[PDB]
Ligand binder design. Structure first.
Ligand SMILES: OC[C@H]1O[C@H](O[C@H]2[C@H](O)[C@@H](O)[C@@H](O)O[C@@H]2CO)[C@H](O)[C@@H](O)[C@@H]1O
Ligand SMILES: [Zn+2]
Ligand SMILES: [Zn+2]
Length: 432
C-alpha cells in the first residue's frame, strides 16, 4: 500500500470493470488513483498477505468472512455518521457488525435462485423431487435438467438446509460453536438427494462453476443455480431465461445462506480516510452502484434509493424471495472452518469416496474443532501508552505463537514500567 493511492481487491465473478469506472471518477474528482484487482482465492490470500503488509487498502467479499478478519485484527473499524447509516437498510449494517463494531460497508444482498431456460422448460419445477423425471424427459431431447457448481458448498447448502441442516445453533443472540448441524437428519437427507441425482445420472460429480455456466448459457441444460452476478453472461447469450424460487425439498423451502457483499478497510492501510471517501461518497451512491451493477448485477443493493427502483426487476425480486426463505450467514470466525468442512463432505460424498453419513460425520467434527486464539486479546494492544509497543503487541498476538512466546515477546517489546501498573498488562492479565 502507498499513501495517496487505493488498491481494491474484489472477486473475479463480480463487476470489477464497473468498480474500476467508479475508481476513475474518484480519481477525476480527487486526484487519488484507484487500482482494482481480482486475484485468485483472494479470501484466503488477504489474511496471508495482510501479515506481510502486502494487502489491499479495501477488500470486498461476502460478510461471512469478515468476522474472522476483524477478530484477527486485519480490519479497521469504520466510522459512518448516522446520516450515512440511514441511507442503507438496517439489516445490511447488522451483517457487518462484529463484537459491537461496524467492520465493513455493506454493498448488496446476495442469494442463490433457480435460473431456468423458458424455451426448454416453460414451467420450472416446484420441487427437487420432480427433477429426476424432468431430466429423463429432457435427456430424450438430448438435454439435461440441471447443472450447478458442486465444488463450492455455497451452491448445495440450500438443499442441505432445506430439511433442517444448519451451521451453528443460534440461541438468544449467540451462535454456539460446539453445536454444529451439518450431520443431522435434514443435512443427511439433502446431501443424499444430491448424491442420488449423481448415482442416477441426472448430474455428474465433477460439475463446477465454468461447466455449469457454459451449459446453461449455451442452451444445453434447462436449469442452473446461481447468483445475481451470473445474469450478465446469460444476458449476452441467446437464452430466454427466468429467475425464480428454488425448488422445495420434502415440502420445505430451500434455504440459501445469504451473503452481504461488503467492503472492508485494511487495518494496515495508510489510506483509511481516502477509502472512506471512496466507499461512502462514490461507491455507495446510485451512480456508483449502477456502474458496478451494469457490469455484473449486484443483487439487492444496500442503498435504499437505488434498491427501491432496482427491485422492480423480477430477477432482483426473486433474489429477495429466496433470501427471505434462507438465513443470513453468521460472520463468526468459525465460518472458515465450517465452509472448508462442508466443502470436503460434499465433494467426497458426490464422488463416492465416502458415504453421506461418513462425510458429514467428519464435517461436524471438523467444523466444531476448537481453535487456540491469542487475537481474543488484541484489544489490549490499544491500551499501550506508546506506538512502538502497540504495533509490537499486535504482531505478537497475530503470530501463531504459544502463550509463553506471547508473554515473552510482550516483555521484550512492551515493558515500559512495572507490569502490575501498565494498562496493557492489566488488560492482558484479565483477558488472556
Ligand atoms: O462455497 C463456500 C463459500 O460460499 C460463499 O462464497 C460465495 C460468495 O458469497 C458469492 O458472492 C460468490 O462469490 O460465490 C461464492 C461461492 O463460490 C461464502 O461467502 C464463502 O466465504 C465460502 O467460502
Ligand atoms: Zn464458453
Ligand atoms: Zn457446450
Amino acid at each position: 500500500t502507498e499513501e495517496g493511492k487505493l488498491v481494491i481487491w474484489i472477486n473475479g465473478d463480480k463487476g470489477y470493470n464497473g468498480l474500476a469506472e467508479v475508481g476513475k471518477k474518484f480519481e477525476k474528482d480527487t486526484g487519488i488513483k484507484v487500482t482494482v484487482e481480482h486475484p485468485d482465492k483472494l479470501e484466503e490470500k488477504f489474511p496471508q498477505v495482510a501479515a506481510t503488509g502486502d494487502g489491499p487498502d479495501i477488500i470486498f467479499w461476502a460478510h461471512d468472512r469478515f468476522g474472522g478478519y476483524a477478530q484477527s485484527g486485519l480490519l479497521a473499524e469504520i466510522t459512518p455518521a448516522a446520516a450515512f447509516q440511514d441511507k442503507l437498510y438496517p439489516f445490511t449494517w447488522d451483517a457487518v457488525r462484529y463484537n459491537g463494531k461496524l467492520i465493513a460497508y455493506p454493498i448488496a444482498v446476495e442469494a442463490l435462485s433457480l435460473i431456468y431456460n423458458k424455451d426448454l422448460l416453460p414451467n420450472p419445477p416446484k420441487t427437487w423431487e420432480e427433477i429426476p423425471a424432468l431430466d429423463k424427459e429432457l435427456k430424450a431431447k438430448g438435454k439435461s435438467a440441471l447443472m450447478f457448481n458442486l465444488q463450492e458448498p455455497y451452491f448445495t447448502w440450500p438443499l442441505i438446509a432445506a430439511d433442517g441442516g444448519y451451521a451453528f445453533k443460534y440461541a438468544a443472540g449467540k451462535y454456539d460453536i460446539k453445536d454444529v448441524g451439518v450431520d443431522n437428519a435434514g443435512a443427511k437427507a439433502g446431501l443424499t438427494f444430491l448424491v442420488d441425482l449423481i448415482k442416477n445420472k441426472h448430474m455428474n460429480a465433477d460439475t463446477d462453476y465454468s461447466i455449469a455456466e457454459h451449459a446453461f448459457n449455451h442452451g444445453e441444460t434447462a436449469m442452473t443455480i446461481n447468483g445475481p452476478w451470473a445474469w450478465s453472461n446469460i444476458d449476452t447469450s441467446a437464452v430466454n431465461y427466468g429467475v425464480t424460487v428454488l425448488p422445495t425439498f420434502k415440502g420445505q423451502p430451500s434455504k440459501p445462506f445469504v451473503g452481504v457483499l461488503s467492503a472492508g478497510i485494511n487495518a494496515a492501510s495508510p489510506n483509511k480516510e481516502l477509502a472512506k471517501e471512496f466507499l461512502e461518497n462514490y461507491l455507495l451512491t446510485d451512480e456508483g452502484l449502477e456502474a458496478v451493477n451494469k457490469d455484473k448485477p449486484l443483487g439487492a443493493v444496500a442503498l435504499k434509493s437505488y434498491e427501491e427502483e432496482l427491485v422492480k426487476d423480477p430477477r432482483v425480486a426473486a433474489t429477495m424471495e429466496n433470501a427471505q426463505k434462507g438465513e443470513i450467514m453468521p460472520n463468526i470466525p468459525q465460518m472458515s472452518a465450517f465452509w472448508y468442512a462442508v466443502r470436503t463432505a460434499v465433494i467426497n460424498a458426490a464422488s463416492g469416496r465416502q458415504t453421506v453419513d461418513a462425510a458429514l460425520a467428519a464435517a461436524q467434527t471438523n467444523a466444531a474443532a476448537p481453535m487456540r486464539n491469542p487475537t481474543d486479546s488484541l484489544y489490549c494492544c490499544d491500551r499501550a501508552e506508546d506506538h512502538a509497543c502497540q504495533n509490537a503487541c499486535k504482531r505478537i498476538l497475530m503470530s501463531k505463537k504459544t502463550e509463553m512466546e506471547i508473554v515473552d515477546g510482550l516483555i521484550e517489546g512492551c515493558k515500559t514500567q512495572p507490569l502490575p501498573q501498565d494498562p496493557l498488562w492489566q488488560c492482558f492479565l484479565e483477558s488472556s
